[PDB]
Paper text:
Escherichia coli YtfE is a di-iron protein of the widespread Repair of Iron Centers proteins (RIC) family that has the capacity to donate iron, which is a crucial component of the biogenesis of the ubiquitous family of iron-sulfur proteins. Bacterial RICs are composed by an N-terminal ScdA-like domain and a C-terminal domain that folds as a four-helix bundle where a histidine/carboxylate di-iron type center is inserted. In E. coli YtfE, the best studied RIC protein, the center is coordinated by H84, H129, H160, H204, and two μ-carboxylate bridges formed by E133 and E208. We show that YtfE establishes protein-protein interactions with the scaffold IscU, where the transient cluster is formed, and the cysteine desulfurase IscS.
Escherichia coli YtfEM and YtfEM-E125L contain a di-iron site coordinated by four histidine residues, through their Nε2 atoms (H84 and H204 for Fe1, H129 and H160 for Fe2), and two bidentate glutamic acids that bridge the two irons (E133, E208). The mutation in YtfEM-E125L induced a major modification of the channel. In this case, a significant shortening of the distance between the sidechains of residues L125 and E159 is observed, from 8.5 Å in YtfEM to 5.3 Å in YtfEM-E125L. As a consequence, the new position of L125 results in the occlusion of the channel and, consequently, the di-iron center is no longer exposed to the solvent. The closing of the channel is consistent with the different iron release properties of the YtfEM-E125L, and explains why this mutant protein is no longer able to promote the formation of the Fe-S center in IscS. In particular, the ferric dissociation constant of YtfE is substantially modified by the E125L mutation, becoming about 4-fold larger than that determined for the wild-type protein. Mutation of E125 to asparagine decreased the V0 values by about 3-fold whereas a leucine substitution reduced the iron-release rate by ca. 8-fold. On the contrary, the spectra of the reaction mixtures containing IscU and YtfE-E125N or IscU and YtfE-E125L exhibited very weak bands, which indicates that the amount of ISC formed in IscU is negligible.
Author numbering: 2 to 220
Write the structure that this text describes.
């Protein structure tokens, strides 16, 4: 019956379900309202297998369940756990990609364009996180979340843009899989990319699937 539940709710209730969905390239973050059934069908996946994997994960509860946590605590968590980390992650990745694209320019597997797309993502996240921290999050903390349809819709649109950039970054890097000739810096950079993707999806998931709907509902 997991297939009839939304991707977002599964990711938020089952430990490491997020990483399972990442493995299947299912967008539980911006597309978290869609059922696992619909997502698995769009990708021609055996949904029974996925339900078995989720059942194994669900043997234990999620260590921290944010679905019912105070919105102020969710906001403060987002800022430290995700916003502050993205601010450090992206500059480092941009410099690594520049070095990789230069040093391995001749090699056929080099992820040409990676720096460009990381820079685009960094520019988007920088302004985006500033708008949330300076406009939307204070509004929610003040209790005006029920009036935030406009601002939230803008943020969710920017989340979609970030999702599109993540898709290009994954394609450019053969789904963040380095070639055999990959140097240490190359492999380390891909590990950092996967960490960024993991974090940004959980980050967007927490906003799209918990903070924003609960704020709009007046919680
Ligand atoms: Fe955010
Ligand atoms: Fe956001």
């Amino acid at each position: 019956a997991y297939r009839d539940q939304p991707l977002g709710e599964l990711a938020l209730s089952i430990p490491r379900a997020s990483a399972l969905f990442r493995k299947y390239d299912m967008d539980y973050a911006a597309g978290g309202k869609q059922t696992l059934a619909r997502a698995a069908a769009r990708k021609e996946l055996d949904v029974e297998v996925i339900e078995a994997e989720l059942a194994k994960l669900a043997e234990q509860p999620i260590e921290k369940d944010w679905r019912s946590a105070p919105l102020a605590e969710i906001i403060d968590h987002i800022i430290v756990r995700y916003h502050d980390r993205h601010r450090e992650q992206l500059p480092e990745l941009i410099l690594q990609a520049t070095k990789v694209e230069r040093v391995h320019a001749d090699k056929p597997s080099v992820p040409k364009g990676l720096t460009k797309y990381l820079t685009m993502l960094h520019e988007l996240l920088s302004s985006h996180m500033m708008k949330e921290e300076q406009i939307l999050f204070p509004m929610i903390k003040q209790g005006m979340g029920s009036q935030a349809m406009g601002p939230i819709s803008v943020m969710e649109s920017e989340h979609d843009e970030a999702g599109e950039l993540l898709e290009v970054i994954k394609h450019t890097t053969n789904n963040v899989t380095p070639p055999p000739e990959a140097c240490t810096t190359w492999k380390a950079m891909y590990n950092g990319i996967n960490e960024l993707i993991d974090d940004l999806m959980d980050h967007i998931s927490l906003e799209n699937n918990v903070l924003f709907p609960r704020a709009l509902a007046g919680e």
